[PDB]
Amino acid sequence: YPFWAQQTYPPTPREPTGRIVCANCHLAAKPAEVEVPQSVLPDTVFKAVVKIPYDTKLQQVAADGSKVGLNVGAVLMLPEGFKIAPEERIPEELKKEVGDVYFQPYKEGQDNVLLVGPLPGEQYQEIVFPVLSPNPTTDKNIHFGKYAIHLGANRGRGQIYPTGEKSNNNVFTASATGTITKIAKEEDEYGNVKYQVSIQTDSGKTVVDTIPAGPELIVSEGQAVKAGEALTNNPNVGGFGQDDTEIVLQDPNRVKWMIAFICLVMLAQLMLILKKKQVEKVQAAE
Amino acid sequence: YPFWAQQTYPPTPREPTGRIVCANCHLAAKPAEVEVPQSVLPDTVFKAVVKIPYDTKLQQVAADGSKVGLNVGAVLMLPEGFKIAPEERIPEELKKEVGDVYFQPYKEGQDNVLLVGPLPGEQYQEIVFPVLSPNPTTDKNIHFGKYAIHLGANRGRGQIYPTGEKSNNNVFTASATGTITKIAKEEDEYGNVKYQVSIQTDSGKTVVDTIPAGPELIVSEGQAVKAGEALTNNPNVGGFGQDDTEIVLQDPNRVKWMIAFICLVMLAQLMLILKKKQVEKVQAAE
Amino acid sequence: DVPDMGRRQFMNLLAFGTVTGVALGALYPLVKYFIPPSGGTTAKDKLGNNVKVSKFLESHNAGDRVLVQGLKGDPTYIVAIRDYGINAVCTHLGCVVPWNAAENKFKCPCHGSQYDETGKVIRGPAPLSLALCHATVQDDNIVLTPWTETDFRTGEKPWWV
Amino acid sequence: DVPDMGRRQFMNLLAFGTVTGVALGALYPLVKYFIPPSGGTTAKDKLGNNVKVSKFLESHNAGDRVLVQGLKGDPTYIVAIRDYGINAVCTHLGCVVPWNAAENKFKCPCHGSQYDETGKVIRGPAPLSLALCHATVQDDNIVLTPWTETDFRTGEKPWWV
Amino acid sequence: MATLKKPDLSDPKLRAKLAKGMGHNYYGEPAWPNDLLYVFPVVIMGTFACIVALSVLDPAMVGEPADPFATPLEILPEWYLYPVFQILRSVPNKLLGVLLMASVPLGLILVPFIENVNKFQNPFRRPVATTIFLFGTLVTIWLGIGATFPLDKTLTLGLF
Amino acid sequence: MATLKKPDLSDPKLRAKLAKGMGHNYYGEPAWPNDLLYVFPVVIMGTFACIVALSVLDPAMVGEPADPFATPLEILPEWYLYPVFQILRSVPNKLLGVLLMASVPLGLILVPFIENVNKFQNPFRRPVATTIFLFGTLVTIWLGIGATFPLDKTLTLGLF
Amino acid sequence: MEIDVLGWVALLVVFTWSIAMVVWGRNGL
Amino acid sequence: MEIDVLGWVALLVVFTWSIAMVVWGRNGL
Amino acid sequence: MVEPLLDGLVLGLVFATLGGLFYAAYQQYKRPNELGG
Amino acid sequence: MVEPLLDGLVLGLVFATLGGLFYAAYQQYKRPNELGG
Amino acid sequence: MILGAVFYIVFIALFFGIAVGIIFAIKSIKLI
Amino acid sequence: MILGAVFYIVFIALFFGIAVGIIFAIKSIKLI
Amino acid sequence: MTEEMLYAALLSFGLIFVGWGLGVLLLKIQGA
Amino acid sequence: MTEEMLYAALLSFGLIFVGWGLGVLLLKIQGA
Amino acid sequence: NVYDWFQERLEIQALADDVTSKYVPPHVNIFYCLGGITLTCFLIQFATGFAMTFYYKPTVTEAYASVQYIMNEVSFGWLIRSIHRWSASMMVLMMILHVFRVYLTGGFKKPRELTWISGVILAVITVSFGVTGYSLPWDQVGYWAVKIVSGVPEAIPVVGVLISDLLRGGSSVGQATLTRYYSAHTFVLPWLIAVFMLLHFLMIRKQGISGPL
Amino acid sequence: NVYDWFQERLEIQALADDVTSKYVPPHVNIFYCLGGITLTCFLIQFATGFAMTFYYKPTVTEAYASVQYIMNEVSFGWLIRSIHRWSASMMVLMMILHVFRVYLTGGFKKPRELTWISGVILAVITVSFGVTGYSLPWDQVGYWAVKIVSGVPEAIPVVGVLISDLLRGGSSVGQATLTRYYSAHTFVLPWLIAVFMLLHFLMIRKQGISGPL
Ligand SMILES: CC1=C(/C=C/C(C)=C\C=C\C(C)=C\C=C\C=C(C)\C=C\C=C(C)\C=C\C2=C(C)CCCC2(C)C)C(C)(C)CCC1
């Protein structure tokens, strides 16, 4: 969960390589998108849209084995100075779009690194961020210019718990090399099923393999398979996705003066061509 | 004394400005010279000559007041790697020139910063240093090239003792502003004369001025002079002097190959002019 | 049915005037660019740090006469700290001038100028006193701001103002 | 009474040959100059320091899989310390390859190559194993020297020798 | 009209030029004022104004400090290097890639000789050439875009 | 002999040159081979060999790290700056020194106009000029050497 | 938030107007 | 300590020999 | 690091140029020559 | 920092040049002209 | 877009008209 | 000095002689 | 990101023709 | 230090004449 | 007067005449501009390039920070550098469109194959500008681009390595690399491009434009 | 063949002819070399200068140490830098002897006063090279030389300061100063000197050498 990134990697969700720590546990891979305007003026509220698409009509394995829908979460790194817009400055139509999203900073201070979710996949297939652009005029250490935004969006249950132990939304290889004899199936009355399995004969051999319910087996009895080969098929239908983009904290005077200069240029060009036209005449009169 | 530089300024005799700490107490100024060869080959003994000239037939004030001859001393900073030649590698004729000079390093390790004297002025008017040039071939951190040598030579008694108190080889200004009444002259039976003097009347006033024997007075009784004006003439006839120069730790292969190339050049030049001569002919035949 | 010189001349001026305009417009920001980015600032030591005023008084010389990376980069002498700093840059050409406790005078070594306990000249080809400035003591460090208040040493306006 | 072509040609060769000689002689040291100054060297961290082997084992990750500014500048993995270092430079193009404890494989992110506990390939367009080298432990730091002894992993000669 | 001067085909000098394919700046509209002094500035000012406009609307970014221990995941050369880069990464024998790269300039050099056989300028009157050009252009654009895809999906451009 | 060609004084073009003082590379020994190809290399190689020789016998030194808090006692600009430096330090009104300095190039510019009055090249046939030149040269050398003395002993050059 | 739009537009306008002035000036292709 | 001397001398010799070859070559001033 | 605007710009100009170039060859391949070659 | 060898070099060449220059003006001021001016 | 289009038209428009405007303006006071 | 002088003479000397030597050598086998 | 590329391509391509036609038209209205 | 300057001046000045004369002589012995 | 002053000595008039005597033939359309636009782009590079040499610091400790200084604190630095960036890409592009016009106009054929060859060289030089500038900010992108290309030449047998060590200042990318690339970008390549631009244009003025289609 | 290949297109022959048609008159003695020696000195500067840009690092933390690196650890670095040093002084000197020959030969008079003027400019440029290079080692001497000259222009009224701030990158000497001086020395001055050297030589080829004495 977004809040496990903070727990295991407190300082930042992003490694020097650009890879986000989510991937460290959500081992699958699905597309992720960000949308911000190309430019924003200083001190303005604008929309920043995260997209986490997936097949809505498809469920995944729950911890015990059920088959529930799946949820989405995300981390969104905006530029220094940027922050979630104050509620009273979010106009209504936007407020409707945003929803009951509990934007929470990665750590105290990092108000531009926002964590989001668990949120219900069905409706938060895309996620609006009302964000407020900083102002170089009242924060002398925030400058105009073009900055990066990094996204790290997920959907579906992870594969490793902050403790280290695997979850059940992945496949369970095989403990040893050789011949198997018995596919049992416990169920201690609290912790559900455990399709137990052993492998033997080769070097003496007797060793066991407990495997949590949720996946499907595509194994059958008596096989002679190797040490670490797929005996469990793959349950995961979620997976993690990244996306980077750029936004321009634009000073309007840069634009206004540029437009001026452009006009001056079109004007000079005119005068030049007209001048040629005058000369094109004189030249006929020779 | 050279050994007071080390005492008051232990790390080095030379300030970042290039000024040597001797001057800090020897306040006068007389010419000082160094002579080293323009170049020396690696691992060679050569002469480095310090000169401290002055009027041999002229004495200065001793501490008590006598009128004894005066002595010379010096600090000589040679380049890293350079050191006083080993006695068995100083050939005889040089050894004769050097004398009973007790070359002593500025501190442990600084074998290229040598202190010299007190030495008798009469004969050590110049001072030979048998020095041995380092070898880049057996000290990989000593390189060929051109390096500086700084000299700081003195003669005659100083003006400040390492304690702070003035000596008697300088003049003694005047303690106050105004009218003087009595020029006494003690002599506590151990510490000699003390031409005592007072100044008064102006602002009430009564204050005294003790002045150690050695100098001559050019003052007389009753004067109305100011606070800090020459009442003692100037005894010093010594003084400090500096001199910098350069020496080239020269690799002989640089020279040998250079000479080769020069010869190749003179050869090519020849061939060219001869070729013109051939052409000067052909051209007459047209 | 052909424009005369005065009319060809009018069109030349109209055109090449506008071109000149565009040129100046482009040349403007290029000029501004080359002028270095820009009362007084906090004072630093050799490495351009910021001096701890505690470790300064504890350890920096009997009867302090000390160099500091002062205002405008100039090394300024800093002598409870004294009211004012003595701007150590010789005023003839521009060498930094050493303090001489054994004479109560500054001496410009380059061409021989001399000064006082206060800056202020008194000899040598140097035609002006060493410059003075405020030295208070904010939070941890020292702060330097320029001396507008006239020269308590000479009388009339300070040459730096 | 005039030299023929063959004699003018002889003098041309004699002269311009000597000129060529001088040119080459001058060009020689200029060429040598541009070739950068130059078994193995002591190993450093991020700032190019030198690593204290004590503060390394005390604090640098559960089941160490760690990057070091190794031989020839190459970042080399350092995994009592293991026999050998794993040269982390991907062998297809040249990206540094991350360790993956959650799979016991190296993965080249650029175009997908994979390796082992030992370097040695096993997937991806990368046509060679990650390079190995000696990691002993002199005085305070670690020392790295090249692996001449053949590949205890593949069999025959190492591609770097 | 514009303003025009016809080839003085009575000038043997101009004819001897034209003969070695080379008298073509002797006739047409006069370059001075007309072109050099009136429209050249329009092209220059225009070129400058477009760049300025782009520079202000989409200014230069500043990336992260280089890290010698951390390879970026995203890591492309500039656009005009895409094709060569596609080639370089997607050809497993390294010396082959280097050679293929050098072949681009070296090849391009040979062109005028290779195509010197006939004397046709117009691309329609040299169908073989114009074809190999368009083919090469296409393969270039293709390779460039391919640089932009993941390596496995690179050559197929993700469609087959 | 050398090898020589006399001015074709029958060529009106050469005469019209010479008339505006300007036909002098039309006659003499031929520059190609003779000079450009045979002795020029001698001058170049010679110039290079002298510098190389000096460079090896008296190589460049490395001074001490610059110290912004410690003015050197010894502190001169290179030799060709001595005169200007003498002027600059030994003239108490700063703006006067700047102006006097600029006067060296600006002055030197005016020379060809100033001395354009007559048409004499030879310094003997322009005694006034040649005198002011030698005087200036002398004052320059003097000032330069003066840069080398202490300021008080600078102008007298230590003799009066 | 639409001085921004005039901004981009001005780029498109000099791009268009330059080509226009070229063609016009030299009666052009 | 007199390969050093040949060293300086060689400088003086190309200085002299160059001027010599110039004069000779162009019969010169 | 990638910058589409630049890329889209490149493409539109590459195809517009290649186009206009063939258009000009054609327009001349076809009412060719005159005034002498 | 000062480097006599360079200085002595400068002087000897300055005076040798000024000399030879006047020598050449003279040598020509005096058997002048011929072949036409 | 739609606002971009409108602005664009209008931007060119003004200028086209300043051109045309200025030929004639210039022309029929006899200057071209 | 004295050794510098001697070397100098001898250095020029050899070369002068290689020159003169080589005209003739070259000349009176008819080459100049 | 990708919407930018298409905008840019369409416009760089098509606006050329707008300017072209605009030029041609300016020509038509001047007469030659 | 100062001995160097004088050496250098004397030699740069005088050696010119040695080379000069040497050139002139080489000329004399070649005949023209 | 003046024309007279200069005419008497330098023959300014002949200069004027070579200019006012070149004519442009009917077949020269708008694409015959691409060369001059490619040049205009470069002059822009030279101006803004030079300007940035007054603030940019070619040191691994200093380079990146000097770039953010020019962006943030230098007057119009953001503009000057944004222009250098854009106009760098525009030069390469206009050069390519220029190569298109040449080829689809047969203007590279006898007697102009040296103009074509010097052009190819110009293109390699320009790409070299781009690659070296790319690495000067010493950021993540620039640094890993160098770390990748610098290794390419090691495949070349006999020399390969030596070549690579030569244009990176040793084994591995580092300060020496940045130093050398900075020399390349602001000293070597500007001179080379100037020479071959000179030859390109000289041959062009001599032979005039290619013929009609 | 080849002469033919090139002749057909470029007219190589005309080039050959302009060369083999210039003659040297009797009055041109040895001092008429001083100009070319002054140039030879500069080419030497350009070579060795360029070479040192491959190791020298224009940073107050790095400059001095890079110089001792070139002296001590770079192959023939000591030679390359000793040459740059000596040949720098030799250029200024030969230039002066060159100015002597011009003046005591009246070769600066109508119609050659622009050759003389461009020459003065060349002399100011060369002195500028010297002054800026002098400070690049960022040692005691170089640093205090800058600290002294940079202040000279403050006497000039109205501007003075502004001029000074411009060529030192602010108030006071420091990193900005070294950065700007490095730009000057290795980028600005090499281009300027090239232009005015170009003009100098062009006017000379056009007007030929001055007349006899
Ligand atoms: C190094 C070098 C060089 C050199 C240059 C210089 C730098 C200088 C020179 C200079 C010189 C070259 C000088 C000369 C001079 C001479 C003189 C100074 C003369 C004298 C004269 C007189 C004084 C007189 C006497 C007489 C005579 C002698 C004879 C006749 C008669 C009579 C008697 C008249 C060169 C480049 C060339 C080459 C290579 C290198």
Provide the CATH number for the domain around residue P60. Answer: 1.20.810.10
Q: Could you say which DSSP state residue P31 is in?
A: G
SS3 P30: helix
Residue found under tokens 């074709």: F8
d(CA F68, CA P148): 12
- Residue from the list A266, A274, A281 with its beta carbon closest to the beta carbon of K22: A274
User: What are the residues facing A20 on neighbouring strands?
Assistant: A14
d(CA A137, CA A249): 12
Report the separation in Å between the CA atom of P87 and the middle of ligand 1, taken as the mean of its atom positions: 22
Q: Could you tell me which of D142, D114, D143 has the C-alpha nearest to residue D130?
A: D114
**Which sign, positive or negative, has the C-alpha torsion F60, F63, F66, F69?**
negative
Furthest-apart CA atoms within chain I: distance in Å:
53
Furthest-apart CA atoms within chain G: distance in Å:
40
d(CA A102, CA A119): 9
Reduced 3-state DSSP string for B193-206: CCCCEEEEECCECC
| Contacting residues for E72 by C-beta, under 8 A, at least 6 apart | A17, A18, O140, O141, O144
Listed in order, the ranges of chain F carrying CATH 1.20.5.510 are: 9-66
d(CA B186, CA B194): 5
Tokens of E85: 């880069």
| Contacting residues for D134 by C-beta, under 8 A, at least 6 apart | D40, D83, D84, D85, D143, D144, D145, D146, D147
d(CA J16, CA N3): 20
d(CA D133, CA D142): 12
Q: Could you tell me which of B192, B193, B196 has the C-alpha nearest to residue B221?
A: B196
| Contacting residues for C136 by C-beta, under 8 A, at least 6 apart | C142, C143, C145
Q: Could you tell me the residue range of the domain that residue M2 belongs to? A: 1-32
Q: Could you tell me which of D145, I26, B83 has the C-alpha nearest to residue O104?
A: I26
| Contacting residues for O1 by C-beta, under 8 A, at least 6 apart | none
Tokens of N31: 């005949």
Q: Could you say which DSSP state residue A85 is in?
A: P
- Residue from the list F45, F52, F72 with its beta carbon closest to the beta carbon of B17: F72
| Contacting residues for O4 by C-beta, under 8 A, at least 6 apart | none
Confirm whether D1-38 and D39-161 share one CATH topology: no
Q: Could you tell me which of A128, A131, A18 has the C-alpha nearest to residue A74?
A: A128
CATH number of the domain that residue A269 is part of: 1.20.5.700
Q: What is the dihedral of CA G19, G24, G27, G28, to 10 degrees?
A: 10
Per the CB < 8 A criterion, the answer to whether B143 and B178 are in contact is: no
Quote the CATH superfamily of domain C1-38.
Single helix bin (1.20.5.700)
Q: Which residue's CA is the nearest one to ligand 1's atom 11? A: J17
Q: Give the E-state strand segments of chain A in sequence order.
A: 33-35, 39-40, 45-51, 71-77, 83-84, 104-105, 113-120, 126-132, 145-155, 178-183, 197-200, 208-209, 224-225, 239-249
Residue M29 one-letter amino acid: I
d(CA E64, CA E53): 26
Q: Give the E-state strand segments of chain D in sequence order.
A: 66-69, 75-78, 84-87, 99-100, 105-108, 113-114, 132-135, 144-146
Q: Could you tell me the residue range of the domain that residue A268 belongs to? A: 255-286
Residue K18's H or E segment, with its range, is helix K2-27
SS3 O158: coil
* Residue P93, ligand 1, Cβ within 6 A: no
Counted domains in chain M: 1
Tell me: do B49 and B145 sit in the same domain. yes
Name the strands in the sheet holding B113-120, side by side, starting at the edge strand that comes first in the sequence: B39-40, B239-249, B145-155, B71-77, B113-120, B104-105
Q: Tell me whether strands B197-200 and B208-209 are parallel, antiparallel or unpaired.
A: antiparallel
Q: Which residues of E touch D112 (CB under 8 A)?
A: 151-152
Residue found under tokens 């005016």: F110
In terms of residues, how long is chain E?
160
**Which sign, positive or negative, has the C-alpha torsion D72, D74, D75, D77?**
negative
Tell me: do A86 and A195 sit in the same domain. no
Q: Could you say which DSSP state residue P29 is in?
A: -
Angle at D62 between CA D59 and CA D66, to 5 degrees: 70
CB neighbour class for A136 (10 Å; exposed up to 12, middle 13-18, buried from 19): middle
In terms of residues, how long is chain G?
29
How far the first Cα of chain A sits from its last, in Å, is 85
Q: Which residues of M touch I5 (CB under 8 A)?
A: 4-5, 7-8
d(CA F44, CA P40): 6
Per the CB < 8 A criterion, the answer to whether F132 and F126 are in contact is: no
Residue found under tokens 């070149």: O22
Go through J24-33 and write b for each residue having 16 or more CB atoms within 10 A of its CB, e for each that does not: bbeebeeeee
Report the separation in Å between the CA atom of J22 and the middle of ligand 1, taken as the mean of its atom positions: 10
Q: Is P27 annotated as a binding residue?
A: no
Q: Could you tell me the residue range of the domain that residue P142 belongs to? A: 1-213
Tell me: do A196 and A260 sit in the same domain. no
Domain boundaries along the sequence of chain D: 1-38, 39-161
Residue O199's H or E segment, with its range, is helix O189-207
Report the separation in Å between the CA atom of P169 and the middle of ligand 1, taken as the mean of its atom positions: 47
Q: Which residue's CA is the nearest one to ligand 1's atom 38? A: F43
Report the separation in Å between the CA atom of J21 and the middle of ligand 1, taken as the mean of its atom positions: 8
Closest ligand 1 atom, residue F46 Cα: 39
Tokens of A200: 């033997």
d(CA E2, CA O25): 11
Q: What are phi and psi of O78, to 5 degrees?
A: -60, -35
| Contacting residues for K20 by C-beta, under 8 A, at least 6 apart | M26, M29
Reduced 3-state DSSP string for chain F: CCCCECCCCCCHHHHHHHHCCCCCCCCEEECCCCCCCCCHHHHHHHHHHHHHHHHHHCCCECCCECCCCCCCCCCCCCHHHHHHHHHHHCCCCHHHHHHHHHHHHHHHHHHHHHCCCCCCCCHHHCHHHHHHHHHHHHHHHHHHHHHHCCCCCCCCCCCC
Q: Which residue's CA is the nearest one to ligand 1's atom 19? A: J20
Tokens of B243: 């001199």
Q: Could you tell me which of C135, C145, C146, C147 has the C-alpha nearest to residue C53?
A: C135
Q: What are phi and psi of F39, to 5 degrees?
A: -105, -25
Q: Could you tell me which of B218, B230, B215 has the C-alpha nearest to residue B66?
A: B215
DSSP string, E52-86: HHHHHHSPPB--PBP-TT---SS----GGGHHHHH
Per the CB < 8 A criterion, the answer to whether F83 and P76 are in contact is: no
Task: Compute CA D107 distance to the chain's CA centroid, rounded to the nearest angstrom.
Answer: 20
CA distances from C136 to C47, C116, L16 (A): 22, 22, 79
Per the CB < 8 A criterion, the answer to whether A137 and A41 are in contact is: no
Any chains having at least 3 CB pairs less than 8 A from chain H are B, F, J, L, N, P
Residue L10: other Cβ atoms inside 10 A? 12
Residue H25: other Cβ atoms inside 10 A? 25
Q: Which residues of G touch E35 (CB under 8 A)?
A: 26
Q: How many CA atoms lie within 13 A of B173 on its CB side?
A: 9
SS3 content of chain H, % helix, strand, coil (to 5): 80, 0, 20
| Contacting residues for E75 by C-beta, under 8 A, at least 6 apart | D95, D110, O141, O144, O145, O148
CA distances from B158 to B22, B161, B239 (A): 9, 8, 8
SS3 A47: strand
Q: Which residues of H touch L11 (CB under 8 A)?
A: 9-10, 13
Q: Could you tell me which of P166, P95, P163 has the C-alpha nearest to residue P129?
A: P95
- Residue from the list F21, F30, F130 with its beta carbon closest to the beta carbon of P110: F21
Tell me: do B165 and B82 sit in the same domain. yes
Per the CB < 8 A criterion, the answer to whether E11 and O196 are in contact is: no
Per the CB < 8 A criterion, the answer to whether P197 and P76 are in contact is: no
Determine the topology of domain C39-161 in CATH: Rieske Iron-sulfur Protein (2.102.10)
List the resolution, Å. 3.2
Per the CB < 8 A criterion, the answer to whether P135 and P143 are in contact is: yes
SS3 A164: coil
d(CA O131, CA E87): 17
CA distances from B239 to B31, B158, E42, I31 (A): 9, 8, 78, 102
In terms of residues, how long is chain H?
29
Q: What are phi and psi of O124, to 5 degrees?
A: -70, -40
Q: What is the dihedral of CA O89, O93, O95, O96, to 10 degrees?
A: 140
CB neighbour class for I29 (10 Å; exposed up to 12, middle 13-18, buried from 19): middle
Q: Is O33 annotated as a binding residue?
A: yes
| Contacting residues for A116 by C-beta, under 8 A, at least 6 apart | A2, A50, A73, A74, A75, A76, A101, A102, A103, A104, A127
CATH number of the domain that residue B227 is part of: 2.40.50.100
Quote the CATH superfamily of domain E67-160.
plastocyanin oxidoreductase (1.10.287.980)
Tokens of I6: 């630049």
Residue found under tokens 């054929």: O109
CA distances from P49 to F52, P85, P183, P190, P196 (A): 15, 10, 13, 10, 19
DSSP string, chain B: -HHHHHHHS-S-SB-TTS-BGGGGT--SB---EEE--SEE-SS-EEEEEEE----SS--B--SSS--B--EEEEEEEPPTT-EEPPGGGS-HHHHHHH-S---EESSTT-TTEEEEEEEETTT-SEEEEEEE---GGG-TT---EEEEEEEEEEES--SB-TTS-B-SSS----SSSEEEEEE-----SSS-----EEEEBTTB---EE---SSS-----TT-EE-TT--SS------EEEEEEEEEEE--HHHHHHHHHHHHHHHHHHHHHHHHHHHHHHHHHT-
How far the first Cα of chain J sits from its last, in Å, is 50
Tokens of F42: 């001698």
Pocket test for ligand 1, best of H19, H21, H23 (most atoms within 8 A of CB): H19
Residue P147 one-letter amino acid: K
In the annotated binding site of B for heme, the residues are 1, 22, 25-26
Tokens of N26: 């080489």
User: C102 and B17 in contact by Cβ < 8 A?
Assistant: no
Name the strands in the sheet holding A45-51, side by side, starting at the edge strand that comes first in the sequence: A33-35, A45-51, A126-132, A83-84
Q: Could you tell me the residue range of the domain that residue H11 belongs to? A: 1-29
Q: Tell me whether strands A239-249 and B39-40 are parallel, antiparallel or unpaired.
A: unpaired
Tokens of A244: 């980077």
d(CA G12, CA K6): 13
CB neighbour class for C5 (10 Å; exposed up to 12, middle 13-18, buried from 19): exposed
d(CA O149, CA O165): 12
| Contacting residues for D89 by C-beta, under 8 A, at least 6 apart | D74, D75, D95, D96, D97, D130, D131
How far the first Cα of chain C sits from its last, in Å, is 68
CATH of E9-66, one of 3.30.70.360, 1.20.5.510, 3.40.50.300, 3.30.1360.80: 1.20.5.510
